Structures are given as C-alpha cells and as structure tokens.
Amino acid sequence: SNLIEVFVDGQSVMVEPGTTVLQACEKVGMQIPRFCYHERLSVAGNCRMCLVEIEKAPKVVAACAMPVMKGWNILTNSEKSKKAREGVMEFLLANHPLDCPICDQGGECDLQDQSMMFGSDRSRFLEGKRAVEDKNIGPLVKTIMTRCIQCTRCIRFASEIAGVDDLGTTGRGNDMQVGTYIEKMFMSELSGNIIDICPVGALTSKPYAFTARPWETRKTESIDVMDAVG
Amino acid sequence: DNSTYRNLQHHEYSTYTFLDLNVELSKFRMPQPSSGRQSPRH
Amino acid sequence: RFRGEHALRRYPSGEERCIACKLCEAVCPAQAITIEAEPRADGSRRTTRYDIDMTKCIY
Amino acid sequence: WSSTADPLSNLVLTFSTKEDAVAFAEKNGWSFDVEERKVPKPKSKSYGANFSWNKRTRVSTK
Amino acid sequence: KKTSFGSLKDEDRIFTNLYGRHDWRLKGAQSRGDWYKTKEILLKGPDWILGEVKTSGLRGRGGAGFPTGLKWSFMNKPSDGRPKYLVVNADEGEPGTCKDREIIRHDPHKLVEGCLVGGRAMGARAAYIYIRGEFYNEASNLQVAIREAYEAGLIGKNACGSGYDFDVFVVRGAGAYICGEETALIESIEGKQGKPRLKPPFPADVGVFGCPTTVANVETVAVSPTICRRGGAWFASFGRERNSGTKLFNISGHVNHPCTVEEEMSVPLKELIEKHAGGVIGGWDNLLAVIPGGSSTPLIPKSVCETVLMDFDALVQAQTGLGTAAVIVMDRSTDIVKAIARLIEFYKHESCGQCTPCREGVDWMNKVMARFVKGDARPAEIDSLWEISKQIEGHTICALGDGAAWPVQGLIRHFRPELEERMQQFALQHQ
Amino acid sequence: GAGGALFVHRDTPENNPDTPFDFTPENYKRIEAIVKNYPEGHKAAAVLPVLDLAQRQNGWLPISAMNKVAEILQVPPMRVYEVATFYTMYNRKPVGKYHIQVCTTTPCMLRNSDSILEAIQKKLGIKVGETTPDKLFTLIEVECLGACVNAPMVQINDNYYEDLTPKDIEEIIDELKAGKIPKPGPRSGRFSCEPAGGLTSLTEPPKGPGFGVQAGL
Ligand SMILES: NC(=O)C1=CN([C@@H]2O[C@H](COP(=O)(O)OP(=O)(O)OC[C@H]3O[C@@H](n4cnc5c(N)ncnc54)[C@H](O)[C@@H]3O)[C@@H](O)[C@H]2O)C=CC1
C-alpha cells in the first residue's frame, strides 16, 4: 500500500504518510519527552523537549512536528538527543520557582519526572529568577503563573476544544505571559480541563487545593451520572 | 547636476499620507481572491 | 545529632514552619505520621491534622 | 484514623497478559470481572494545517 | 579566471542612485534604465527568467546566501487552486544594516520592477512588501512610486502589453526585529504576533494566508531586472565562483567616513574600509576588531581582517559568515566586552519568546554578560557561558537564537584573556 | 535591561472599556481601503494597520480602541490585545506630543550616542523613561533604527534626525519648542549617508536604458 519504511533505533517500522517522528517512536513503544505536544491539540513545537537526532543529519529535529521521511533512522537515545534534552530542561528550570513542597502538582508533575529522567541533577544558574503576578479567572482554576512554562496548552485547548478565545500571550521574550490581559473569568462547561492539560502547577484545582498528595490516593475507575453522556 | 540632493519631498509627508496613498491606490487593484468563507471562525 | 522526642518548630515571627508538603509522611518507614491539610482562613497552606504514633515510630 | 476490617484492601497483583490474570483468579477461586484494554487510537497530526487557506483548522494565535 | 576583486567601475553598478542625488521618481528611474523592455522580459516566460537568475549565481541577499534561483524555482510548480504570492522582506532589523532603506527611499522603481519580474518568474498574483514600521517616509516614497507605476500601466491590469496581472501592496510593521524572519513576517502580515512557524512546511508550500509564497530580500528582488536585462553571465563575471555579483556594504563604527557603498563581491575587508570608509579612526594599526556581517556574525580581530575577503565562503572559512555585509569596526579604545554585552541585550529585547531555548537562554546570557562587563564572575564561568550558547544554538525554532549565540562565541574565542583580566581586576579590587 | 512596562491591564477612570473612542469617517474610508488590500477570507490581516491608525487618531491606544478595532474586524479582543502588547510601536499609555526615541545599540553607541542621550536629558529635565510636565516630550531608549551609517541618530514622530551632535539635538529640541518643524535628515551637511568628504562612488553619470542589454532581448 502507501506505507513507508522508517527506522527507530535501527528497527524497521511501516508508517502512514504524514506520520511524525514522535508517532513513529510511539509505534515501537518509545515515548519521546514532551511539554507542549498534546494528541488532542494542534501542534505547537515551542517547548523543544522532543528534539531528537536523525542519523546522518547534523541538526536535531522536533519529533512532535516533523513528518518522518522514508529510510530515516531515528536515534532516540543517542548522545546528541540526550544533550538536547538536558539543555532544554536546564533552560526550563532556570527561572522555575522552588515551590515543589507548596505546589499541588508535587508527585504528579511532568516537569519533575522529566527532569529526573532526562535532565541533569544540578544547576549552574547563578542569577535571580523572574516573578510574574497571578491572574484571576474564576473560582474553579487557581492560577500561579510564576510556575508557567509557556507551553500554550491552555490557550490551544480554550481556542480549539472549548471554543473560547479569551486566553493568550502578552509581552515579548522572557516577560511574555499567559493570561487574559483584562480581569475576566474563563468560565465554560469545559474550563476545568485546563488543569489536567497544564503540565505544571501553574493551573490547579481550587477546591482541591492543599488537600492531598497523589501517592496517597486510591483510584476507583467509575462512571459519571451528572448527565446522560456517561 | 550630481551635487543636488533630490529627496526633499519626504519633508512634506503628514501623519495620514501613507493611508491617503493607499486609498488612492485602492481603485487600481485587481479583485481579491476568496477562500470561500467569511473567516476561519465561520 | 541525637534524636529524641519529636517537635514542630516555627519561624521567629511565631508562624509554624510546616507547609503540609507531606514529605515526612511519605518517607516514614513505619507509616507513623498522619497528615491532613486545607487552606487556612488567610489562604495559607497549613495542616489541620499532624499525628505521630510514637509506638510505631522507629526514631 | 481510618480503620478497616478486610485483609485484602491493599492487595494488588501484576500480570503480563489478561490470560495470566484470568488463570490466576480461576485457580484461586475468585469471581472476576475483566475489562478490555483501552489503547489511544492513532491520530493524524499536521503542523501545516494550522495555517490553512480555507479550512477551519487555521489557528488565530500561537 | 580573475584573481583580484574590489575595483568596481561606476558604470558597472546596479544601484546608480544610492545617494539620492538623482530623481528617484518614475522619470528619473526610467532615465537610469529602469522599466526598459520589461514587456520583453515578461513575455520571455518564467522559465527563461529562472534560468537567467540561476546562471547569475545570485545568492540570498538577506544574509543566509541561499541560491535565489533554486527557491524561485521551488515556486515554479503548477497551480493547485490557491493564489501565489511574492513577499518582499524590507524589515531591516540587523544592527549595522541600512542598505535596504537606501534602495527603497532612493530607488523604489527598481524594487517595484523586481517585484513584477519575480512575480512573473514564480507565477505570483501580487507582491506584499513588508516595510519596517519606523521607515515611514521610505514607505511613503515607495507608495508614490507604486502609484506612478500604476498610472503608467507598468503594474496592475495587464501590467504591459504582456497580458499579466500583478498587484504590489505595502504593509507596515510595528517595531519588531523578529518580524524580519520570513515565517514571522508571514505571521505578522496575517495579523498575528510576529512569532516564526516551524519548517517544514516551507513557504513555497504553505506561506502567507496558507498559500504558496516566497520571501525575498529587497536587494535580491531589486537586482533581478538588471540581471535579466544584462544577463546572468555578466553578474557572474564579478566575484569568485559561488560568490558572484556585487554587494551593498554598510561601514559603520570607528571609521572616519561611515557610509553605504556598492562594490564588487569578493573585495578585501581592509581595501573596502580604506577606499570607501576613509580608513579606521586613528589608522589601520588602531583597529581592534570588526563585525563583518551585522550583529549576528562573530567578531574577528586585526590579524584576521588583515587579508580576508568579503564573501560567503571566505568569511565562513574565517569562522564568521558574510551575513548582511554590515561592517562594524572597533578601534583599540572601546570596551569590546561592553559592545558584545550591548548586542546580547539587544537580542534579549528582540526575542519573540515562543521557544524556551531562545527566551530563557538569551535572558541568561544577557545577565551573564552584564556581570562579565564588571568582572563580577569567575574564570570557570566562561566555559559555562560557551556551553549555554551551544545549548541555545541549533535547538531553537528560528535563527535568532543562533544569531545571539554566535557573537558570544566569537567574543570568547578571540578575547578570553581580556575577560580573565577583567575578572582578576574585579577580584583584586573587591577582595 | 528590564522592561518596566506592564502587560496586564487594570481599569482606570481614564482607561476603561467605557472610555469614548470612535473612528472618524475619513478614517473609516481608510479602513475600507486597508481591508480591501486583503483576500475576502482573511480580514484579521488588517489588525496591525488599523490598530496603528487608531494610534494616529488618538496618539495612544486605550483599551476601548482595541475593543473597537476587534469589533470592526470581528476578531476576538484577546488577539488584538496580543498584537498590541507584542509590537513596541504601540503606546498603551498616553505619550507626549513629541516622542523622542534614541538608539543606543552598539553601532550607535560606538559613535557617542550617550552624549546625545545625556544632552536630551539635561535639556528636558526628565529621565530616560519620563515625560515632561507640560506633556510636550517623551524620551525613550530604543534599539537599532536602521540608520547605523548616520549614527548617532534619533527618531521623533516619524522623522529621522541623524548625525547628531549635542548642539544639534538642542537646536532640534528648542526649534520644536518654538513651534515649527525641523527639517529631517542627517546634520553636518552630508546629504543622506555618502562618505563625508570621499565621494568615491556614483561619480560619472549613470548609464541609461539599453546600456548593457544582452543580445536577443
Ligand atoms: N536583512 C536583515 O536585516 C537581517 C538578516 N539576517 C540574516 O538572516 C540569516 C538567517 O536567516 P534564515 O532564514 O533563518 O536562514 P535559512 O538558510 O534557513 O533560510 C534562507 C532562505 O533560504 C530558504 N531555504 C533554506 N533551506 C531551504 C530548503 N531546504 N527548502 C526550501 N527552502 C529553503 C529559506 O526558506 C529562506 O528563505 C542570518 O545569517 C542573518 O545574517 C538576520 C537578521 C536581519
């Protein structure tokens, strides 16, 4: 048929045209690190955590956005890709606040886990960090924007899934901030989901605040009855 | 001949000169292409 | 370095140091610590329950 | 404190396949409910679709 | 066959009204050879124009030096149903660069004719010229020239006795250096923030309004009608192989006569500086360093500038890159660390903030360089800064991160002893 | 170094959604032309020009101006907010009658731009980012303005004043204070960026049409 042959760590795999490097790695069972990529959202490509080396290619490519080409050998664990991951994690952690004990996303943080699995174990940042003022978007989503890593997942979800275009970015460079630019509540029947998509403790549940840690909780798989969707 | 500088009319441009020239140019333009809808939100 | 009876300390201003992160509860080899927390009246992250079973503690 | 009386409240077992877990449950005499594995279906991603000429996939911000 | 370059005859230049001493208007442009036999070039077909551009050896005048014929041929695919556009990059963001401003204010008609010729070559329906927002009078002059071209029938309906329809639009930016990047320029035209998009797709597939597009520099567009009229062989006669033609140079900084001048491509840097800029202030011995291709190119010291040529390959061999051919010279009386730190501060102030490496790392490098200027650091931090620059370079969405990493690398490579001396002085006087 | 300008809006008696703003009918005709410049599926492309036009009508951009532009183009207000806070030429706060922008980038800093900055500072009695008490001038430090050959230079209300000495900028300031407009361009009489005494190029008359046209054309 129309399937093309690519290689993940030298292992052959047949993929459809338009498949990205990230999905090609997924088909073999390797999960590429990510912060801005979501399956249900449009591709952003700004967090650069998915950078991976293509064999016989001098430049690393963004796996979440780059379509795979026939005969490409993706080197998921090569030295170049690991160094790229370490550099990106260092940049992400340079201005991040030391809020882990008081952050609700302590044991459930993709930033924490991906720093432990793909980043370095120390810092060489000898400067001062930046701090931004928090935003009020209603009584459901608690906002602490110093923890924001500017992945723009919340903006994409609000625009594409919820159909609400009130979220965005203001400023430029290091002081670019995610918010509304006016005092306004982000109130929609799907508003709480931005808590789930946010990889960090920038957006958290307000009624759930400070009540439990993830390792304590017992998970019961069940069904909603608040409507007839099930 | 050469010694004379001949770009002095930019000395007499106002605040609205650019948009006025655009308004004058509007009648010289070919009809615009259409994507089929009013906007991507339509 | 001697370890004796447990104590909860506070800052010089008089406010307690504990911010209910539950790291001590997580690491406790005997599960001797029980913690419950909620936002305070002024929004602070503080504990409402902090129990140590001294007969389960291994010090 | 939270008190319980059933000894199996914390018992969770790990298995490689559904068949292994079913065999373990049947040989141990436990009535079981099996739930089929949920796998996220593969999706069609296209970065260029963000800048569409006429489709609605065109994004207003990035 | 030629071995020496850098004595370009006056009659052999393209931008004959660079200094604005003639009439930039339609009559004045027609006097200097503009809009001559444009109908013939239009009727000779897009394939012929593309071939002439290919044989000309014309490379990217924006700073990257990509062969322009190859890109304009990338646009040569059959129609797909969407319109096709040409976008002329007139952002002029690079510090030290002033050539496009001069060729827009004093010779707009060459730019308009280049727009028409390139649009015919790529089959575009219209040309969007993204002028810098600060260049208001230049934009007004361009609009007046476009009005004159419309009145004379040189552009617009049928554009000639040629049968081709072509529109030229002028859109103004609003203070953004990143909007010079081609994809960020496309985003800015569409009414969004000037944040670049990822590649692929390339503009020839998905560009402005999602349509096939080519983004070209003002100089690249403006030299094209002259290339078509005089032939690609004439243009390739100048300069070395793969570095052919003539170039506009902006010499600024510590020179007696800072100026813009058009000269043959592979001219020696010293020869150009002495012949046109009046030499280095205080004499050639007074020279300390040169930034040859705008703020995004690494500096080189006197020993390299002694016998280096001014083109892509020779400057790449000198570990710099030709860039935009904007020469910024510094004598031995200036704090080179302060100048590099000022450039890094500019890059911190100009990054769009989309991708984390550029955003956070350039902020970090700015803070580190600010500390370096005073000597408040330790010698072990120089290598750490080098590693930070390497972590930025090659990991960002666009080349602004590379353009911020390269000056730091050049400063370290050529003046590490000065940084260490500053650190020792600060430690001595602070204890 | 630091920005110093906020990117969050808090309502003010002089800057709130009910602040009166509207477009003049001539500006409405200009808006019609600007919109007509674009294909009839993508009208958001006119956000940057029209916003600019609003500033040209008001001197600055109140939140009501952004709301009106968003309403006119039928784009969400947040996109207009993003555009207004991204581009530095937009004044989201009131600015003086004469906005003075001094370039301090390295090519201009090399040719003594600090002397010009301090001369303006002394003449106006204001600091780098302040405005005069009579609301006549605003001083602002900007990046490279594309006139590096004519450094040092400043930009005042769309006009480039180049090759400045401190005396030159003082004469410009007090001529603006007098009431009439100083003539733009470089000082020192070099006529737009050729060598000051060199004249090493474009010396003989330029060649006309057909000078070097190839055969068969
Ligand atoms: N003129 C000015 O004011 C400024 C110039 N620059 C210069 O711009 C340079 C970097 O610009 P970039 O666009 O990032 O370099 P680039 O090499 O990635 O792109 C150059 C041109 O070639 C095209 N191109 C390159 N590879 C292609 C491919 N495989 N397929 C199709 N098209 C391809 C690109 O679409 C682009 O139009 C820098 O060296 C800098 O000196 C930088 C800032 C300002």
Ligand SMILES: Cc1cc2nc3c(=O)[nH]c(=O)nc-3n(C[C@H](O)[C@H](O)[C@H](O)COP(=O)(O)O)c2cc1C
């Ligand atoms: C950050 C950045 C800013 C740029 N600014 C400009 C600019 O202002 N003018 C320009 O012509 N090119 C600029 N470029 C280079 C453009 O990408 C270039 O114009 C484009 O690739 C095609 O130009 P060409 O016709 O010379 O090949 C910039 C590139 C980057 C990375």
Ligand code: SF4
């Ligand atoms: S978001 Fe993650 S890394 Fe940041 S403070 Fe919270 S738990 Fe720690």
Ligand code: SF4
């Ligand atoms: S608030 Fe969360 S989801 Fe939104 S951009 Fe910041 S990190 Fe991403």
Ligand code: SF4
């Ligand atoms: S919960 Fe335990 S570890 Fe955390 S602050 Fe309180 S006492 Fe310390």
Ligand code: SF4
């Ligand atoms: S490198 Fe800088 S300017 Fe370029 S996309 Fe990334 S953040 Fe924006």
Ligand code: FES
């Ligand atoms: S996951 Fe690909 S750049 Fe963020």
Ligand code: FES
């Ligand atoms: S450095 Fe000042 S105009 Fe360019």
Ligand SMILES: [Mg+2]
């Ligand atoms: Mg979250």
